[PDB]
Amino acid sequence: SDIVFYGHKTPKSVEIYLSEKNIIYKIINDQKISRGNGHFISIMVNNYRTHCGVVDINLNFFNDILYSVRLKNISKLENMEFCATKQRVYFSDKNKKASYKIINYGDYYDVDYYDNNLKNEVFDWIGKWS
Ligand SMILES: [Cl-]
């Protein structure tokens, strides 16, 4: 997979990274939704300093592998292609750059970094099992 969070791809290693940096985070998952056999974990942090500014972040995992890093609430006055490309290396596997999509909400932007293959697998899985 081509996406990491500062070198980490698994929920627990990401949780340890954030905890040791004294960053508060919230964890949500599909364990109750699925009644026991969950496949999704998302970790949420607020006010995280990136090259797109101070942003909120979701770290999205499928089968304990990161597939998506979403930066939220970026100023509409930010140079989006520049800040997205500047932050990219920190969310990219050493082998391969993560993909990214700029999402315009009108009053602000999100940037979603993602592994295209993994994200397609997630979409395929949702359509199959729901
Ligand atoms: Cl939590």
Rounded to a whole number of angstroms, the distance between the first and last alpha carbons of the chain is 25
Indicate the pairing of strand 65-75 with strand 53-62: antiparallel
Q: How far apart, in whole angstroms, are the C-alpha atoms of residue 43 and residue 15?
A: 8
Task: Give whole-number Cα distances, 86 to 14, 17, 34, 43, in Å.
Answer: 21, 21, 38, 23
Other CB atoms within a 10 A radius of the CB of residue 58 amount to 17
Tell me how far the alpha carbon of residue 68 lies from the centroid of ligand 1, in angstroms: 19
Q: How far apart, in whole angstroms, are the C-alpha atoms of residue 107 and residue 17?
A: 32
Tell me how far the alpha carbon of residue 72 lies from the centroid of ligand 1, in angstroms: 19
Alpha helix locations (H) across 21-79?
none
Tokens representing 35 are: 């009644």
96 secondary structure, DSSP code: B
Residue corresponding to tokens 């109750």: 32
Tokens representing 89 are: 């290396």
Indicate the pairing of strand 40-50 with strand 65-75: unpaired
What technique was this entry resolved by?
A: X-ray
Instruction: Write phi, then psi, for 14 (nearest 5 degrees).
Output: -70, -45
Residue pair 64/93 in contact (Cβ under 8 Å)? The answer is no
Sequence ranges of the domains in the chain: 11-129
Alpha carbon 76 to chain centroid, angstroms? 20
Alpha helix locations (H) across the chain?
11-20, 80-88, 116-129
- The residues whose Cβ lies within 5 A of ligand 1, an ion, are 26-27
Residue corresponding to tokens 């009108």: 106
Task: Give whole-number Cα distances, 10 to 14, 29, 80, 102, 128, in Å.
Answer: 6, 14, 28, 24, 24
Tell me how far the alpha carbon of residue 82 lies from the centroid of ligand 1, in angstroms: 33
Q: How far apart, in whole angstroms, are the C-alpha atoms of residue 33 and residue 45?
A: 22
Tell me how far the alpha carbon of residue 44 lies from the centroid of ligand 1, in angstroms: 9
SS3 content of the chain, % helix, strand, coil (to 5): 30, 40, 30
